[PDB]
Amino acid sequence: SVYDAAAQLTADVKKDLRDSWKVIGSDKKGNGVAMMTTLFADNQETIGYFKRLGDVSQGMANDKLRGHSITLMYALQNFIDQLDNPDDLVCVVEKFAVNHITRKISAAEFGKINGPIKKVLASKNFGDKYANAWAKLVAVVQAAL
Amino acid sequence: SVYDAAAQLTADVKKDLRDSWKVIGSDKKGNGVAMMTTLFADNQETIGYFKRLGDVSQGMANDKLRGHSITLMYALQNFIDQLDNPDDLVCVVEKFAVNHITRKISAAEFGKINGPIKKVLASKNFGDKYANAWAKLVAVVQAAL
Ligand code: HEM
Ligand code: HEM
Incomplete structure (x- = not known):
């Protein structure tokens, strides 16, 4: 249930999401591409979906x-902006x-983004605590x- | 080209876009729904596209x-955030x-959004100069x- 899942976003989880987003969200182009390239590097089997x-x-040289x-x-x-409601x-x-x-992306395959997020967070000095919040x-x- | 159209946006136009967005962009849920409902009210022929x-x-009650x-x-x-690059x-x-x-949305059809934008801007007292910028x-x- 998406509603039960949303209920898991407690006060502490929300703060950790906001605090870390202030940093990684400040460079959307740089961190966005970093997340994607990491996904493709760590999970080659997903590249086909991005034809x-x-x-x-x-x-970064690829405009699309x-x-x-x-x-x-x-x-x-x-x-992040919707966390209040x-x-x-x-x-x-x-x-x-x-x-x-x-x-045709399943819940399991969507979850493969967790690895890339953990790594991008780690590169900015945000550990497991933050990776788990995300x-x-x-x-x-x-x-x- | 698209680049030509983009590169044309002048400092004054970007200024008006950012000044008006500070306001209408501050309540995305309210103004977003207002924009869509206005589109449907003034251009009923577009309703079918959003089935x-x-x-x-x-x-607002419609979650989708x-x-x-x-x-x-x-x-x-x-x-708005990409205006300077x-x-x-x-x-x-x-x-x-x-x-x-x-x-299958043509350039002409996409332009139908100008009416709704003008009205939403006007609701916050942003006149023709701002509508033209948008x-x-x-x-x-x-x-x-
Ligand atoms: C934090 C997680 C993710 C977010 C927020 C996200 C967000 C997005 C957004 C906004 C789009 C554009 C939607 C559109 O215009 O059609 C998109 C497209 C797509 N996403 Fe994700 N996504 C995420 C993770 C993933 C993962 C892990 C996969 C694959 C294993 C995936 C596969 C796709 C595919 C195939 C497209 C279509 C790309 C295209 O052809 O333009 N996404 N995603
Ligand atoms: C300020 C102008 C507009 C912006 C920024 C905009 C933005 C968007 C965005 C972000 C989506 C979601 C894309 C996706 O996930 O597939 C969307 C979907 C769509 N837009 Fe627009 N749009 C605009 C104007 C229009 C106009 C004027 C029309 C039609 C006359 C139109 C027709 C559509 C249709 C039919 C969809 C698919 C909706 C659905 O089935 O989910 N858009 N638009």
Whole structure:
């Protein structure tokens, strides 16, 4: 249940999400592309889904990948801004869930983003505590897939 | 080209866009839904395109419409944040252009959003000068359709 999952976002989890987002959200282009390239490097089997983006190995030089990556960060910004109201968080989560359901992305495969997030956070000196907080937010989307 | 349309946006236009966005972008849920409901009220012929959202006459109560409306405002937030780097603005614009090209939305049809934007701006006392500024930003997307 997406609603039960959303209920897991306690006061402490919400603060950790906001505190870490202040840092990684300040450079959407840089961190967005970093998240994507890490996903492709650590999980080669997912590259097939991103056929439209072309040669993703080009990274920042790939205009489609850069546009996609920046936009992905605004999806996260959206989630963060909705933390105060669970009903609004749920409706935006289900909107993006549909974007992935149509792409045939399962909850299990969506969860492969946790690795990349953990690594990007770690590069900015945010440890497991923060990685786990983000895993709970990702879990809300997983519940809708 | 899209780059040409983007590179054209002058300092004064960007100033008006950012000044007005500070206000209408401060209540994404409220103004986003207002924009969509106005589009449906003034251009009833577009309702059919949004059948995935269900009964759009439900307004704020429609969770799918609310989720869509909030997300649409983040696309605009994205545009506004990229104003000073045409290269980044172009790649995000082309990303969203694809979202509409796949739905068979022509440049002319996409321009129907200007009416609703003008009205929402006016509700906050931003006159024609501001509506014209926004029409220029919308024109950047039209250059990609
Ligand atoms: C934090 C997690 C993630 C977020 C916030 C997210 C967000 C997004 C957004 C906003 C889009 C664009 C939707 C559209 O315009 O159609 C997108 C597209 C896509 N996402 Fe994700 N995504 C995430 C994780 C993943 C993962 C882990 C996979 C794959 C294993 C995935 C696969 C896709 C695919 C295939 C597309 C379509 C790309 C295209 O052809 O343009 N996403 N995602
Ligand atoms: C300020 C201008 C506009 C912006 C920034 C915008 C933004 C968006 C965004 C972000 C999406 C979601 C893309 C996806 O997840 O697939 C969307 C979907 C859509 N847009 Fe727009 N849009 C605008 C104007 C229009 C206009 C004027 C029309 C039609 C005359 C239109 C028709 C559509 C349709 C049919 C969808 C699909 C809705 C669905 O089934 O979920 N858009 N738009």
